């Protein structure tokens, strides 16, 4: 459940 | 003053980072001058595979190597970063939305505190609370073997032998031919400012970019075109495999914090001759490390959780005032005895005057611009 998790990027709030 | 201690073996829950976005860039000249929104020191990658068989010597030019960085008056200055931030401010007219503003290397050292001993990862930082934001600056070694100097020089030599000052389509042949005798210089760098975050914390990090791999989009975010050049000893057995895995983990952390998608390694031999070059994508490094060494592979997720916990602790234990005219506070962070120690700098300390009412942490122009808002 947690060992197979890869560090990834997430969408973040941005301006333009 | 506030005093806090944190155990580097604690783990948080954050697993992902906000997508890094370039907000600016600047170029630092050989005489400690900051050119904002200027790419005079941005290099372009060019190293054909056929050149790896030319037996390039990475020790050449060591005697005429010009280390301008060691002669800098403020080697770890935040002045250029703050000027880039301020140019972005003036473009938008509003205070930028971030909680911690520092350098990429400072964050990388803070994260690696959880995997390296203090004798290896020396951390000594000054954190200043201004306008509701944390500005972190590392105080230099201030100290002022031949093999160690050569090893440090070989990275700059590899970056000189594998990059061009101008795009390949704009470079005459004679420049490429005389590249092997070019003088290696340290100190003139190109730095990109990147807005990212972990968990609930939003950071701004300045990263020294080595080269552009494919091409540069003028006026656009160029993170996907940047690459990170590193030089290392050639691997010959499984022990060197593990050593390289730890080094690759460190480089992956460095590139992941800011979103550099390409990593290039020059493997050299005992005679400082470039044996080979290998290319990695920072997205596949965690999976490769897991498939080759699970102990280092899980360290990626452990590092992201530790990074989130560290940022949350720093935001919680440091009081921030959103008023630019409020009292500025200065703190000192040190990694020792398996703990991160944070302690406010008192007025009796000799460093209080420099950090609070001087241009050691924050330049005068940046703080007066922030006040004028």
């Amino acid at each position: 459940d947690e060992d197979n998790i890869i560090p990834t990027y997430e969408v973040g709030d941005g301006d333009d | 003053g506030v005093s806090a201690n944190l155990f580097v073996k604690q783990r948080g829950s954050t697993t992902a980072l906000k997508q890094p976005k370039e907000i600016g860039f600047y170029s630092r000249t050989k005489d400690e001058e900051y050119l904002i929104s200027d790419d005079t020191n941005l290099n372009y990658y060019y190293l054909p595979d056929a050149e790896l068989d030319r037996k390039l010597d990475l020790s050449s030019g060591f005697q005429k190597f010009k280390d301008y960085y060691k002669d800098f008056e403020d080697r770890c200055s935040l002045r250029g970063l703050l000027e880039t931030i301020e140019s972005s401010e003036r473009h938008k007219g509003k205070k930028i939305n971030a909680d911690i503003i520092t350098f990429r290397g400072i964050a990388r050292k803070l994260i690696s505190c959880a995997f390296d001993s203090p004798s290896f990862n020396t951390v000594d930082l000054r954190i200043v609370s201004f306008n509701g934001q944390l500005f972190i600056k590392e105080v230099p070694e201030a100290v002022n073997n031949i093999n160690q100097d050569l090893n440090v020089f070989t990275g700059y030599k590899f970056e000189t032998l594998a990059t061009l000052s101008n795009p390949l389509q704009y470079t005459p042949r004679e420049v490429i031919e005389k590249r092997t005798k070019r003088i290696v210089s340290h100190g003139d760098e190109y730095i990109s400012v990147v807005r990212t975050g972990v968990g609930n914390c939003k950071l701004i990090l300045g990263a020294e970019v080595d080269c552009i791999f494919d091409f540069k989009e003028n006026g656009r975010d160029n993170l996907k075109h940047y690459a990170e050049l590193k030089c290392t000893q050639q691997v010959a057995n499984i022990s060197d495999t593990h050593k390289f895995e730890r080094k690759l983990f460190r480089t992956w952390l460095q590139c992941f914090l800011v979103g550099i998608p390409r990593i290039i390694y020059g493997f050299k031999d005992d005679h400082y001759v470039l044996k080979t070059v290998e290319e990695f994508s920072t997205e596949e490094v965690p999976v490769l490390l897991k498939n080759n060494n699970p102990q280092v592979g899980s360290a990626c997720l452990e590092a992201i959780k530790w990074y989130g916990l560290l940022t949350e602790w720093l935001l919680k234990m440091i009081p921030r005032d959103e008023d630019p005219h409020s009292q500025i506070r200065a703190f000192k962070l040190v990694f020792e005895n398996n703990h991160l120690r944070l302690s406010e700098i008192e007025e009796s300390d000799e460093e209080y005057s420099g950090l609070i009412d001087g241009e050691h942490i924050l330049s005068n122009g940046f703080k007066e611009w922030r006040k004028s808002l």
């Binding site: - | 054909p48 595979d49 030319r54 005459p172 050639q234 044996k275 080979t276």
Partner: protein
């Protein structure tokens, strides 16, 4: 089989692969159209360049069937041939149609000689046949394939219509984008293709792993494919080895119904040259790009369309090995390569030519000896006009041939030989310096030409190391000036009525330029079609003055026909750049025809500059077929965008290097082939052997660096390799 292709097959066999032509499927007795968007059996392609002279010429006078009676039948055959070529190639991004324009004066001299011969020697046979018929139908003139003729305008209109029809009809053409550079754009077809490729490389956004294909029957294309330094390159051409076996059963004439084709793979040729051009112990670093450039220069020196070949270098596809052997021993004694991005190193060239002149008399003697042996084998098996041989008096196999050569072929006194000797040699060196630039950087000079009918001897090439070679580019001739300078009086019907009075009337001021009879020098050639025709050289000033005198009498149509043009770009309404181009070019402000848009490679696989079309294209318009036959439907411009196209000027000199990010294809040659090419190891049946040859096309992998001992991934790859071997 031509000697060039026999040499290529014997020396580099694994560059030749067969084209897989996918026949249309059949069901319910209805022919299913070929799916263009389907996967290509040969391999995916991005850019296709057509040298249209290699399509119109087979269509005009095919050897399979009698030639078409009318011009419309020729255009229908052109449509069919182009459609077949594109169905077997299937570009995914770019199509370039290059029709020969006004060539430079160096090419115009050879064109003038060719048309003069193909007129006079053809009309003598026509007169013989007519007399034979009378004692007891008119052939179409091949000189109509020349810029300035009405047939070229008809072909340009037909090509534009066919392209619009394919883009607006075929769903597999939505992402294609077609550039038509007809005869109104100066330059040859291959010169245009080379310039296009050079401009494409100069883009920073250019994909280094673009796959290119060129169509054409010219044997220079191979070398030109090497001159691009884009290793993902191949040549599509007609299978000559099948033509060899065609002479003899239903399948044999089925191959007549559809002629098989061939891929000549350039990456495999580079693999061959990597072992072929290796010289050990150089005082400088050995670069394969520079060695390939030297090989290409030597190949063009051994033979080209702009200078007569040296007496010792009788034929190309041979004596290329002679020059390679000389180069392999000259190079260790020099400081650098003989060429640098289209520039000659004159000291190195002089060293090469001195070594060539040292062994010239020996090769003359051996050529005579083998000619005598061949004559013995054949025996065992068994002047104002006319044809005259200057070589028989020269006696090149006998001592003292220098003076005899010069006196016989130039009619000068011996005391005046040296002044001639130093002139011709210089004009020859400025020749090769021209030719190389013409194929590496663009046309050095539109007006330069070699003012002699003969080449100097090999021994005469000395004393030019100090030569300072410069060219004035000038401007190309107009189509009418090019016509007046390549056509005889017998082919003057192509020109307007005004100009044809300067070809035949005895009172015309340039009547001396158009003799109905001229001498022919065989120059030692046995066959008659390759003899040297001693035509007088056109005086540019006199010809230009005379023709511009006749311009004011031309009508509006001819004067419009005498205007230089620019290429055009045609795209479908589903293209990536359709909205941007239409918005920026066909808006209210852009309607002034003043704005251009410069676009780069990443978005749609093509870079350049496009502007509002000059052929009257408009949105919400109609396209009508210009052929009165075939029931070809009218079109709508709502499914098409047409623009005026031009190349982005090169920011700097093009470098003969491999670009950053280039991932090579899967290597084809094993160690045995490389060893045989390196160490000169030597071991009808080739036609079947070519079919089993298959060459992977496109990048193989993600990384541009091959595994090499001392790396992490290399360590694991070699560990797995050793595990698999054991």
């Amino acid at each position: 089989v031509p000697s060039f292709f026999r040499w290529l097959s014997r020396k580099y066999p694994k560059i030749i692969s067969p084209v897989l032509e996918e026949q249309p499927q059949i069901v319910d007795g209805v022919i299913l159209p070929l799916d263009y968007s389907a996967s290509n059996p040969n391999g995916e392609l991005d850019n296709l360049y057509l040298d249209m002279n290699g399509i119109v010429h087979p269509c005009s006078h095919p050897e399979n069937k009698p030639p078409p009676e009318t011009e419309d039948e020729m255009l229908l055959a052109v449509f069919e041939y182009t459609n077949r070529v594109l169905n077997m190639a299937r570009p995914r991004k770019v199509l370039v149609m290059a029709v020969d324009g006004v060539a430079p004066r160096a090419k115009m001299n050879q064109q003038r000689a060719r048309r003069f011969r193909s007129a006079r020697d053809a009309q003598i046979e026509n007169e013989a046949r007519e007399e034979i018929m009378r004692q007891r139908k008119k052939t179409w003139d091949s000189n109509a394939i020349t810029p300035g003729t009405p047939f070229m305008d008809k072909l340009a209109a037909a090509l534009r219509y066919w392209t619009a029809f394919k883009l607006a009809t075929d769903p597999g053409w939505k992402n294609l984008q077609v550039i038509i550079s007809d005869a109104t754009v100066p330059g040859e077809g291959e010169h245009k293709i080379m310039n296009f490729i050079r401009s494409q490389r100069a883009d920073p956004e250019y994909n280094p792993n673009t796959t290119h294909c060129i169509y054409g029957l010219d044997a220079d294309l191979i070398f030109l494919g090497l001159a691009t330094h884009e290793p993902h390159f191949k040549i599509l051409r007609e299978d000559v080895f099948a033509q060899d076996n065609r002479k003899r059963k239903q399948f044999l004439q089925k191959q007549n119904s559809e002629q098989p084709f061939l891929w000549l793979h350039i990456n495999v040729l580079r693999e061959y040259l990597s072992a072929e051009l290796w010289v050990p112990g150089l005082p400088f670093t050995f670069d394969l790009e520079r060695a390939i450039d030297d090989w290409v220069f030597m190949c063009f020196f051994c033979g080209n369309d702009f200078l007569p070949h040296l007496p010792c270098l009788d034929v190309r596809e041979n004596s290329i090995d002679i020059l390679l052997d000389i180069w392999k021993v000259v190079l260790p004694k020099l400081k650098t390569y003989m060429t640098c991005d289209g520039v000659l190193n004159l000291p190195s060239v002089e060293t090469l030519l001195q070594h060539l002149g040292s062994r010239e008399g020996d090769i003359f003697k051996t050529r005579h000896i083998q000619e005598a042996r061949k004559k013995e084998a054949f025996e065992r098996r068994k002047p104002k006009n006319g044809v005259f041989d200057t070589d028989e008096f020269v006696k090149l196999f006998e001592p003292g041939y220098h003076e005899r050569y010069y006196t016989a072929k130039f009619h000068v006194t011996p005391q005046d030989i040296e002044q001639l000797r130093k002139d011709m040699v210089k004009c020859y060196i400025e020749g090769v310096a021209w030719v190389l630039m013409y194929y590496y950087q663009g046309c050095a000079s539109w007006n330069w030409f070699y003012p002699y009918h003969y080449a100097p001897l090999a021994t005469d090439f000395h004393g030019f190391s100090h030569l300072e070679i410069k060219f004035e580019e000038g401007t190309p001739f107009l189509p009418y000036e090019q016509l007046m300078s390549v056509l005889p009086a017998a082919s003057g019907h192509a020109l307007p009525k005004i100009f044809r009075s300067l070809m035949s009337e005895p009172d015309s001021e340039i009547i001396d330029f158009y003799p109905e009879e001229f001498p022919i020098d065989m120059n030692g050639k046995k066959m008659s079609w390759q003899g040297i025709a001693l035509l007088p050289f056109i005086d540019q000033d006199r010809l230009l003055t005379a023709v511009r005198a006749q311009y004011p009498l031309l009508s509006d149509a001819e004067r419009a026909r005498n205007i230089r043009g620019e290429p055009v770009l045609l795209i479908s309404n589903k293209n990536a750049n359709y909205e941007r181009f239409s918005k920026k070019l066909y808006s209210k402000e852009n309607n002034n025809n003043n704005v251009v848009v410069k676009f780069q490679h990443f978005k749609s696989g093509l870079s350049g500059i496009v502007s509002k079309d000059v052929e009257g294209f408009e949105l919400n318009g109609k396209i009508v077929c210009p052929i009165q036959g075939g029931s070809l439907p009218n079109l709508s411009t709502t499914l098409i965008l047409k623009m005026s196209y031009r190349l982005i000027p090169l920011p700097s000199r093009n470098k003969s290097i491999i670009l950053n990010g280039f991932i090579p294809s899967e290597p084809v040659l094993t160690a045995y082939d490389l060893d045989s090419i390196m160490y000169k190891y030597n071991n009808w049946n080739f036609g079947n052997d070519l079919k089993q040859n298959i060459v992977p096309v496109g990048p193989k992998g993600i990384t541009q660096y091959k595994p090499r001992t001392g790396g992490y991934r290399a360590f694991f790859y070699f560990a797995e390799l050793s595990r698999n071997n054991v």
